[PDB]
Amino acid sequence: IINGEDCSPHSQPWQAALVMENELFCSGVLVHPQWVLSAAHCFQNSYTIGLGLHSLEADQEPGSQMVEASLSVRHPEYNRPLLANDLMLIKLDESVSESDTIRSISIASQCPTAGNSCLVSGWGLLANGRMPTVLQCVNVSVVSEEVCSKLYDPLYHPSMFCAGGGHDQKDSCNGDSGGPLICNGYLQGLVSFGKAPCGQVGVPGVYTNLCKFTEWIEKTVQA
Amino acid sequence: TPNCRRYSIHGCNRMYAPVCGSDMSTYANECTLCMKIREGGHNIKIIKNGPCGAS
Incomplete structure (x- = not known):
C-alpha cells in the first residue's frame, strides 16, 4: 500500500x-x-x-x-x-x-460509482519499496470506465475497474493482490494489477470488479 | 533469463513473487522486472529467485 x-x-x-x-x-x-x-x-x-x-x-x-x-x-x-x-x-x-x-464482509451487488472514496488494505510494498510491519490502509477514489479503458487499452475488460491515480500517489502495490477494496462498507473489489512503479501520478490501480460475479x-x- | 513475451507491457499482477536482478535490485515479480527492462532500455538478468542477498 x-x-x-x-x-x-x-x-x-x-x-x-x-x-x-x-x-x-x-x-x-x-x-x-x-x-x-x-x-x-x-x-x-x-x-x-x-x-x-x-x-x-x-x-x-x-x-x-x-x-x-x-x-x-x-x-x-x-x-x-x-x-x-x-x-x-x-x-x-x-x-x-x-x-x-x-x-x-458482504460483497457489493452494485457496480462501482465513479467518484466514490473506497478503502484498500494490505501488507504489500510501501512507497519506499520496504515491507510494513502491520496492515496498511489507504483511501482511493474510483475513476470512470472511460478513464480505465484509455489508460489500460487494450487490456481493459468489464471484469475490471480502476481506482486511484490521484496526484497524492495513493495506490495498492505488489503484495496487495487479492486484498479488499471497500466502498461504503461492502466489498467492491480485489486488488488485481497495475503498472510499475505503483502510485504513479495519473495512473489508477486495477481491481477485480466483483459486481459482475x-x-x-x-x-x-x-x- | 526473463521471458518478457509471457507478460503484458500494459500491466503486472500485484502478487509478491520476488526476483533478484543482475542490477542488484530485487523486483516484486518477474513481470515488474520486465517493465523495468522496457522503461530503462537495458536487459536485466535474473541472478536468482527471491530477494537479492546483501554482500
Whole structure:
C-alpha cells in the first residue's frame, strides 16, 4: 500500500494473509466463515492463511488463527482475455469461529460509482519499496470506465475497474493482490494489477470488479 | 533469463513473487522486472529467485 498508514489494529477483520515459506505473497478476504475470496493469480494447490492478524506474527496477535485450505476454484474465464476475471474462491478446511478480530464482509451487488472514496488494505510494498510491519490502509477514489479503458487499452475488460491515480500517489502495490477494496462498507473489489512503479501520478490501480460475479460467487458457495 | 513475451507491457499482477536482478535490485515479480527492462532500455538478468542477498 503506497502512501497509506497503519490500519487501526483489527479494523479490517475480513483480511486474510496468504503466506508460504513464511513470506506473504497475496491477501484474501474472508466472505463466509468457510470461504476466502482472492485474485485467481494468487492460486496455489494448498494454502496457509492467517486470520485476525495485524503484524504477520501470529504468536503476538491474540485471537489470530492460521488456518488451512486445500480447495480452491478459479473463475472459469480467468486470464481470458489477459488479466481478466481475476478472482477465485478458497474453501477453508474448517469454518472459522468469528470474533471481534475475524469476521466476514458482504460483497457489493452494485457496480462501482465513479467518484466514490473506497478503502484498500494490505501488507504489500510501501512507497519506499520496504515491507510494513502491520496492515496498511489507504483511501482511493474510483475513476470512470472511460478513464480505465484509455489508460489500460487494450487490456481493459468489464471484469475490471480502476481506482486511484490521484496526484497524492495513493495506490495498492505488489503484495496487495487479492486484498479488499471497500466502498461504503461492502466489498467492491480485489486488488488485481497495475503498472510499475505503483502510485504513479495519473495512473489508477486495477481491481477485480466483483459486481459482475455475484451469480458465480453465490452458485459456488451455495453448492 | 526473463521471458518478457509471457507478460503484458500494459500491466503486472500485484502478487509478491520476488526476483533478484543482475542490477542488484530485487523486483516484486518477474513481470515488474520486465517493465523495468522496457522503461530503462537495458536487459536485466535474473541472478536468482527471491530477494537479492546483501554482500
